[PDB]
Design a protein around this nucleic acid. Structure first.
Lengths: 162, 74, 79, 71, 83, 74, 82, 90
RNA sequence: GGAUUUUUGGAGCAGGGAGAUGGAAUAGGAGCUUGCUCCGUCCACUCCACGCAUCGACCUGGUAUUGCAGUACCUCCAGGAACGGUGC
């Protein structure tokens, strides 16, 4: 059950709780996120929860994409061309993923408009100084794992590994 | 057509009207009109510095009427 | 209930000096004696004067036919 | 003659541009002779502003175009 | 003689709505009187403008000449507004 | 004197040198040739005046009612 | 006599419309109403100090249109006969 | 009634532009002056003209003036501010 | 069916003054390249008049509320002022 144009044209699309145009693509078990050109950047949020996506890549240019729900998936790697395809990506929910190393968070630093990031329920969050490395690598993010970044955490991230 | 505005409840009540260009007046309405023209007897207009100047009975047309707020409980 | 047309007719019968403010123009106003009126609020002022509040000057013109689409507020003065 | 210019875009998401430079993207449900647009669950872009059901008057309308497929 | 947005605005009288004027003034409150010419008379209204001067007044009256838009709740967008 | 309506005053002002000033600040001075019921003006040998200074002669000039602010009979 | 009947008979023609805000929209006129509601298809709009954008459809009101631009090969003498 | 008012009022100044095929100037609210021959008119001053020349002045945003020419155009009566008839075709 | 609430528009235009202040990589003219001098276009800082006052959104610290609802907005104190509009 791969993501095609007929699956995106038959999927439900409505208004979310934040008054944004969201398309519900849950319950599809798509192994790879592709063929997203049929939406023509008419959705403000993408609900791709409960899927089997392994890599968050292969997305076309969508300037209206501001929220991406990748919860309950097996995402273990992030694409390096995420900034060239989503310049206005501000919300990224990557809870309960397959990220084990902090080096997968290195392509996530290119998103300058990203402010809300969720990396909870992951083996990469259980490593030593994971939050300090995420604050040092991504200074544009203001809320990490439902927690506001303070000045002391930014000073601790800028002190170590400088 | 040509229905008059519902100004029967705001009759003989002290209200503040706003006019275009940032003008503010306060006075008691003495009548109504289908062209939204209001007659304010003993009206006082607010200047730029904040002083109130009494202009007496004035007539405000509906082409520049922005908002009328009733200062009395009707 | 006092009608605005009846008030304009009483002001034209009394021949008192009235000042008319323009729409979207607070710097310059007109002042004169309204002689007659019409359905489109067209005022005919005799020996009218344009008063500029910024420069504090007064320029007389005489018989002026002011349209009702530009006059926003009209007040009665003692002068 | 047919007057089907406004009926073909009924129940669809359209983005109308205002005179001051604002853009309201909403689902056009009904119209009138004064071009009164009723945009249910509309978004305001110029930043995103949560508005919802916005009834904009026809005097502040400039242009309107199709935004996407109907929900 | 009566429009469908005019009928939707007349049917939404008594609910917590808002009216944004052409100058940016947002009069919010319960729509007590709504005529066919977009005349909105509200009681216990609140002024939240584009200037931001938020205040509370006992009664307000905004005409349809300088009215830019109206924000209404979505309780009447289902029925009988489905055509 | 007697209350004169503006329409016979505009009908009797034809052929006399008047000056019509618009809302943009410019005025046209000339002999009033044509004046209809929609408050439109058509003059001959018109001269343009801006900020109290003459600009030039144009001839027959037609001014609508939506732009003309006032008119004074000289 | 009436310009609305002349504007309504100018369908399927590539024209341009300049608004009061400086935005020029060039496209094929497909629908004209009595209130000069110009409904065009595959238009290109250029605003003041902005980039031109191509749209599949556009609907401009009559009160917002300031000027129009017709091609030189338009039969204005034949279309004027009512 | 309407024809006599159009041939005897200010609209006759427009009617002398289409009958004798004379050139008149129209100054708009956008600080532009278009000189041309009036081909079609109406009661709402909808002027459809041919062979028009529009001149104005622009700033870089010193400024400078500019001009252009159009084969056939149509302008509504709302944006028409000033209309001047002068013997410029001869 | 162009005369006040919708469609023949009341819209257009310009951002205070000064200083031997600083820059036009590839884009001004003149004294007929380059170097220099003069004059009608910005941004950054400083001074006078942080252009002024207002309220809303917002950041730091302290502090109060533990409450079952369908919402313009919601505790208070102090500092800073990146944003919006109102009148001069």
């Amino acid at each position: 059950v791969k993501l095609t144009a007929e699956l995106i044209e038959q999927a439900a699309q409505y208004t979310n709780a934040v008054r944004d145009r969201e398309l519900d693509l849950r319950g599809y078990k798509i192994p790879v996120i592709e063929n997203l050109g049929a939406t023509l950047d008419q959705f403000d949020a993408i609900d791709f929860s409960d899927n089997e996506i392994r890599k968050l890549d292969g997305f076309p240019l969508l300037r209206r994409l501001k929220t991406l729900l990748v919860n309950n998936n097996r995402i273990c790697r992030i694409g390096e061309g995420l900034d060239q395809a989503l310049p206005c990506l501000t919300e990224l929910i990557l809870t309960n993923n397959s990220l084990v190393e902090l080096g997968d968070l290195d392509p996530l630093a290119s998103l300058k408009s990203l402010t809300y990031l969720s990396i909870l329920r992951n083996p990469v969050t259980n490593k030593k100084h994971y939050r300090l490395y995420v604050i040092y690598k991504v200074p544009q993010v203001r809320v990490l794992d439902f927690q506001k970044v303070k000045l002391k955490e930014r000073q601790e991230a800028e002190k170590m590994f400088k | 057509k040509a229905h008059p505005p519902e100004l029967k409840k705001f009759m003989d009540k002290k209200l503040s009207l706003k006019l275009n260009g940032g003008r503010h007046v306060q006075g008691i309405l003495r009548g109504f009109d289908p062209f939204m023209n209001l007659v304010i007897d003993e009206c006082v207009e607010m200047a730029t510095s904040g002083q109130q100047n009494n202009i007496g009975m004035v007539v405000i047309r509906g082409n520049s009427i922005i908002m009328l707020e009733a200062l009395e409980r009707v | 209930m006092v009608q605005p047309i009846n008030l304009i007719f009483r002001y034209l019968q009394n021949r008192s000096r009235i000042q008319v403010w323009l729409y979207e123009q607070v710097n310059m106003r007109i002042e004169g004696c309204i002689i007659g009126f019409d359905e489109y609020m067209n005022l005919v002022l005799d020996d009218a004067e344009e008063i500029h509040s910024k420069t504090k000057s007064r320029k007389q013109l005489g018989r002026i036919m002011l349209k009702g689409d530009n006059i926003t507020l009209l007040q009665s003065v003692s002068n | 003659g047919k007057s089907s210019k406004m009926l073909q875009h009924i129940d669809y998401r359209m983005r109308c541009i205002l005179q001051d430079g604002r853009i309201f993207i909403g689902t056009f449900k009904a119209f009138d002779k004064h071009m009164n647009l009723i945009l249910c669950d509309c978004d305001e872009f110029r930043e995103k502003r949560v508005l919802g059901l916005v009834l904009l008057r026809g005097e502040n309308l400039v242009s309107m175009t199709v935004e996407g497929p109907p929900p | 003689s009566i429009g469908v947005p005019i009928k939707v605005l007349h049917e939404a009288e008594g609910h917590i709505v808002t009216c944004e004027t052409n100058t940016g003034e947002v009069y919010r409150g319960k729509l007590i009187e709504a005529e066919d010419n977009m005349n909105c008379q509200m009681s216990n209204i609140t002024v939240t403008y584009r200037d931001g001067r938020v205040a509370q007044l006992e009664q307000v009256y905004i005409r349809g000449s300088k009215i830019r838009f109206l924000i209404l709740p979505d309780m009447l967008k289902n029925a009988p507004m489905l055509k | 004197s007697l209350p004169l309506n503006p329409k016979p005053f505009l009908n009797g002002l034809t052929g006399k040198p008047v000056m019509v000033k618009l809302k943009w600040g410019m005025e046209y001075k000339g002999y009033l040739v044509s004046v209809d019921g929609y408050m439109n003006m058509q003059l001959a040998n018109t001269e343009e005046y801006i900020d109290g200074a003459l600009s030039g002669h144009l001839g027959e000039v037609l001014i609508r009612c939506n732009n003309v602010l006032y008119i004074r009979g000289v | 006599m009436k310009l609305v009947r002349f504007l309504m008979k100018l369908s399927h023609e590539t024209v341009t419309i300049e608004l009061k805000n400086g935005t020029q929209v060039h496209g094929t006129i497909t629908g004209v109403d009595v209130s000069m509601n110009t409904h065009l298809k595959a238009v290109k709009m250029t605003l003041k100090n902005r980039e031109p954008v191509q749209l599949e459809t556009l609907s401009i009101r009559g009160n917002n249109i300031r000027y129009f631009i017709l091609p030189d090969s338009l039969p204005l003498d034949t279309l004027l006969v009512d | 009634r309407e024809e006599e008012e159009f041939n005897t009022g200010p609209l006759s100044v427009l009617t002398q532009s289409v009958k004798n095929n004379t050139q008149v100037l129209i100054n708009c609210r956008n600080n532009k002056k278009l000189l041309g021959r009036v081909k079609a008119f109406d009661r709402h001053c909808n002027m459809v003209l041919e062979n028009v020349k529009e001149m104005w002045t622009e700033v870089p945003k010193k400024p400078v003036n500019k001009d252009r020419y159009i084969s056939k155009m149509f302008l509504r009566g709302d944006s028409v501010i000033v209309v001047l008839r002068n013997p410029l075709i001869a």
